[PDB]
Design a protein around this ligand. Structure first.
Ligand SMILES: CCc1cc(OCC(C)(C)CN(C)C)c(F)c([C@@H](Nc2ccc(C(=N)N)cc2)C(=O)O)c1
Ligand SMILES: [Ca+2]
Ligand code: NA
Lengths: 250, 28, 5
């Protein structure tokens, strides 16, 4: 996260760290959506152009974390993966269209002060909140700058951007399964996700029921926090039928 | 049933330092 | 990263 701030304790209790076993390193963020299921970006697990193809045994999921590098004894929980499910129409060839995957945990994780699931939006939530200017929140342990690494989870609040402005900012083809967020040059304020943040949540707090909903997944971007560029996010609601299908079946 | 209600915030009626920024942006 | 047990 570039130009964000340190999270408060328990500020993002759905935050999950995707952790590579060997070598030991941060792969991506992710989010807890029940005691058994974790949501992340497909590209965190599968990206053939760069020979990325992680299997269940390659990684661990770390939940309840605040510190990036510490083993947070008596606080974080480490879970193994039973199965990965990548969207069958995930487009890694071109533009990361449908950049979404689910991970089933081998065992249910116990909820605590530091571990608690986020809500997924329904149609009405999404219609009400997914509006240009409306702000959401992005969290992660990724790079502090495009060109280093945080001590603790970082947080930034960013406004959703009008679709034509998103389109006009890039040569990449933008689909309905994506939205973009970030401040405009004329807006003065800064902030963005960066390397290491992909797969993490873009959340909004409903003013109707005071619940946090995950509207996006950190997906892609060109550099980090550049003027006239915006972060791109997987549109969770648009892909929710897939999410439901997978959990209902497996 | 309890999704998106944080033990250390919503559940005990405490607000985090910047959530009000989000509320102020939800204008419509 | 600190070692995990
Ligand atoms: C491992 C696969 C991968 C693919 C990415 O994009 C692919 C593509 C074709 C959409 C464009 N590419 C030229 C960046 C990509 F951005 C990443 C990239 N993800 C990323 C996400 C958000 C931001 C931001 N908000 N500034 C920046 C970077 C990364 O971690 O390298 C990773
Ligand atoms: Ca364009
Ligand atoms: Na920018």
């Amino acid at each position: 996260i570039v130009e964000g701030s340190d999270a408060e304790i328990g500020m993002s209790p759905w935050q999950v760290m995707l952790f590579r076993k060997s070598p030991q390193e941060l792969l991506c963020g992710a989010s807890l959506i029940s005691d058994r299921w974790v949501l992340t970006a497909a590209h965190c697990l599968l990206y053939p152009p760069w020979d990325k193809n992680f299997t269940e045994n390659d990684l661990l999921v770390r939940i309840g974390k605040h510190s990036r590098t510490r083993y947070e004894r008596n606080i974080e929980k480490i879970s193994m993966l039973e199965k990965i499910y990548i969207h069958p129409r995930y487009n890694w060839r071109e533009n990361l269209d449908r950049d979404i995957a689910l991970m089933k945990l081998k065992k249910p994780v116990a909820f605590s002060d530091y571990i608690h699931p986020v809500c997924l939006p329904d149609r009405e939530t999404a219609a009400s909140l997914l509006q240009a200017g409306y702000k959401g929140r992005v969290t992660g342990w990724g790079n502090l700058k495009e060109t280093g690494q945080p001590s603790v989870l970082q947080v930034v609040n960013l406004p959703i951007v009008e679709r034509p402005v998103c389109k006009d900012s890039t040569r990449i083809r933008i689909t309905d399964n994506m939205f973009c967020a970030g401040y405009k040059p004329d807006e003065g304020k800064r902030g963005d996700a960066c390397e290491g943040d992909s797969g993490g949540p873009f959340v909004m707090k409903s003013p109707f029921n005071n619940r946090w909903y995950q509207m996006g997944i950190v997906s892609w971007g060109e550099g980090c926090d550049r003027d006239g560029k915006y972060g791109f996010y997987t549109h969770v609601f648009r892909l929710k039928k897939w999410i439901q299908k997978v959990i209902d079946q497996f | 049933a309890d999704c998106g209600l944080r033990p250390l915030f919503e559940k005990k009626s405490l607000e985090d330092k910047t959530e009000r920024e989000l509320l102020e942006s939800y204008i419509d | 990263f600190e070692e995990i047990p």
